[PDB]
Paper text:
The male abnormal 21 (MAB21) like proteins form a sequence related subfamily within the large and diverse family of nucleotidyltransferase (NTase) fold proteins. The human MAB21L1 structure exhibits a high degree of structural conservation with cGAS but features a number of differences.
We crystallized native MAB21L1 in space group C2 with unit cell constants a = 167.7 Å, b = 177.6 Å, c = 115.6 Å, β = 126.5°. The native crystals contained 5 molecules in the asymmetric unit and diffracted to a limiting resolution of 3.05 Å. The crystal packing of MAB21L1 is unusual and consists of an intimate assembly of ten copies of MAB12L1 into a decamer, formed from two back-to-back stacked pentameric rings. The pentamer interface is composed of hydrophobic and some polar interactions between the N-terminal helix α1 of one monomer and the C-terminal helices α11 and α12 of the neighboring molecule. A citrate molecule from the crystallization condition stabilizes this interface. During model building of the MAB21L1 structure with no nucleotides added, we observed an additional electron density not associated with the polypeptide chain in the ligand binding pocket. However, we were not able to identify by structural or mass spectrometric methods the nature of this low molecular weight ligand, which may be a buffer component or have co-purified with the protein from E. coli. The fact that the structure of MAB21L1 without any nucleotides added shows density for an unidentified molecule in the ligand binding pocket may support the suggestion that this positively-charged site acts as a binding site for an acidic ligand. Although the equivalent region of MAB21L1 is ordered in our crystal structure, it notably does not adopt the α-helical NB-loop conformation.
Numbering used by the authors: 0 to 54, 64 to 87, 89 to 99, 102 to 141, 145 to 174, 180 to 215, 228 to 359
Write the structure that this text describes.
């Protein structure tokens, strides 16, 4: 009897993925196509004032929030991760300051300033917005953020293998195979100009590729969707990034690709919600690549607890009656 309920769960989850998850990616695509015209148009204007800025590398934060990473024409004339500041990193010799496309922006100390490029970029964006009612500029934040049609918020973050991520993959876990490891590692990493004077690290390119195989993406698509529909809560305790970062952890716990067959979608999804409820209750949720930073950092105890209540309540309605997914 325990066999048939596993299959019923996998069936209704596939319906959720095809009915509700696809609808998400459809509404998001409508919202992104509307948003992306505004940004690329504005970015075209920034290109005429500053040609170094140019118009793929997108990030969905929520259905209404996005982060555009703008990959700048670089020279990489500058060569550095230390325990100094967690999750964030920062030239070689006192020569070749004139080698950078952004040569003016290297500091007197000889370091290259994220704070200064983002300000220069922010001044340009706030100026380009002056269009009437459809675009707004977000202030009191160091990062560039636009408010479009008073409905959506888009952050535009200037952007281009690390010391903390060096352990991964630990040869302990058969996953990933040497083929998947070197393949995902070739993606490299990205540095995002955000506050913490440092650059934020992001592996959205490696993370999303690491989860290739099996139902991992269907699981993420289902997790992101459930979060949108039922876990947008006071305190914004839960992000698409929380789900994304958990799916990777569950990949380790179940190393074998067989654990990720389509038959196992219910198990892996159920396993992930539970680990999430633990993270909420334990009050700690670590980054996949960098354990030193906790993605619950700064979250109120009241909100982390309530999120645990709703996440738990959600998994039970699912298991007791998996058809309940239709009405979710």
């Amino acid at each position: 009897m325990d066999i048939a309920a596993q299959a019923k769960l996998v069936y209704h989850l596939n319906k959720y993925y095809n009915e509700k998850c696809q609808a998400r990616k459809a509404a998001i695509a409508k919202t992104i196509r509307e948003v992306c015209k505004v940004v690329s148009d504005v970015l075209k204007e920034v290109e005429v004032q500053e040609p170094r800025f140019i118009s793929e590398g997108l990030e969905v934060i929520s259905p209404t929030e996005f982060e555009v990473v703008l990959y700048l024409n670089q020279m990489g004339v500058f060569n550095v991760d230390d325990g100094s500041l967690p999750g964030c990193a920062v030239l070689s010799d006192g020569r070749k300051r004139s080698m950078s496309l952004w040569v003016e922006f290297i500091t007197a100390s000889g370091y290259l300033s994220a704070r200064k490029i983002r300000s220069r970029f922010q001044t340009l964006v706030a100026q380009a917005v002056d269009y009437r009612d459809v675009v707004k500029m977000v202030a009191d934040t160091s990062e560039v953020k636009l408010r479009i049609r008073d409905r959506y918020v888009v952050q535009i973050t200037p952007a281009f293998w690390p010391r903390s991520a060096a352990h991964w993959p630990l040869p302990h876990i058969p996953w990933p195979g040497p083929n998947r490891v070197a393949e995902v590692k070739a993606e490299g990493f990205n540095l995002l100009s955000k506050e913490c004077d440092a650059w934020v690290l992001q592996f959205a390119e490696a993370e999303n590729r690491l989860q290739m195989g099996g139902c991992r993406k269907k699981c993420l698509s289902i997790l992101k969707t459930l979060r949108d529909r039922h876990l947008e809560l006071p305190g914004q305790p839960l992000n698409n990034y929380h789900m994304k970062t958990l799916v990777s952890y569950e990949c380790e716990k179940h190393p074998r690709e067989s654990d990720w067959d389509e038959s196992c979608l219910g198990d892996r999804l159920n396993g992930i919600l539970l680990q999430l409820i633990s993270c909420l209750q334990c009050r700690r949720c670590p980054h996949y690549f960098l354990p030193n930073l906790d993605l619950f950092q700064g979250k109120p105890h009241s909100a982390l607890e309530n999120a645990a209540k709703q996440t738990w309540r959600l998994a039970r309605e699912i298991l007791t009656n998996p058809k309940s997914l239709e009405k979710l």
